[PDB]
Design a protein around this ligand. Structure first.
Ligand code: A1ADA
Ligand code: A1ADA
Ligand code: CL
Ligand code: CL
Lengths: 123, 4, 123, 4
């Protein structure tokens, strides 16, 4: 086409979606990870994760307001990944990289799994 | 704005 | 912080949100523009438009599944702007620039209003 | 991935 493009548009959209999350505006699901609860927008979870994409395209699970993750999933690893979904920023540290990679593999977040594998290989 |  | 960043994350998120829109997945509102109907995600509309942000943060309008725009709003201008919201791409043409600018001013999409003003000034 |  003959379209023009606004370079910062996608980043600005994501920034506003994170502002909505921080204010708990139009969040439509709670992700339960052991004792911890995380509120989010199903569409953003689907856009970032192969696991959530599969869950919320399911004709029955699409209507659930609560999703319980596998008890092996670490709440901090999930929190770091949820922050990444809404910001593009990953808080990858020596102390959390194993839990982050395992959570990213479960959530099917291929690019995060790739950088964790590379950072582990370097050490 | 750019030409993509 | 000590975060790393995935450059393409915001663009990939927006691409997936547009895929959900194209398949009518988890759309939660219909925007009525004269005789025309447009399905969308309230969160994406809010993230892109000062008008939708104000509408869906309203304690009563947040729960509406149908929003009717001012009858002066042109459906093609709205369609072009809705496509821009989900893609960062604006189909700005000689034949539509006046309707696009007027719709962007009504929707409070400041960056679109700015490029329309500049393109009009050049001609 | 980059250092933002
Ligand atoms: C694959 N597909 C057509 C599609 N459409 C819409 C959405 Cl929201 C979606 N999201 C999704 C699926 C798989 C994966 C991701 C997002 C991230 C990832 O690493 N794998 N995937
Ligand atoms: C202003 N603010 C705190 C905020 N938080 C969340 C959202 Cl979704 C939002 N969106 C929004 C508001 C105003 C405008 C836009 C989006 C685009 C624009 O030109 N004006 N604005
Ligand atoms: Cl990823
Ligand atoms: Cl804009």
């Amino acid at each position: 086409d003959s379209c023009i493009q606004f370079t910062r548009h996608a980043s600005d959209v994501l920034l506003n979606l994170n502002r909505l999350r921080s204010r708990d505006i139009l969040t439509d699901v709670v992700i339960v990870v052991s004792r911890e609860q995380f509120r989010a927008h199903k569409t953003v979870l689907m856009a970032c994760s192969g696991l959530f994409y599969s869950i919320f395209t399911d004709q029955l699970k699409c209507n659930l307001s609560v999703i319980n993750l596998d008890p092996e999933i670490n709440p901090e690893g999930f929190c770091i990944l949820l922050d990444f979904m809404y910001t593009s920023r990953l808080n990858l540290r020596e102390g959390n990289i194993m839990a982050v990679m395992a959570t990213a593999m479960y959530l099917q977040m291929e690019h995060v799994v790739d950088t964790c594998r590379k950072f582990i290989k370097a050490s | 704005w750019v030409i993509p």
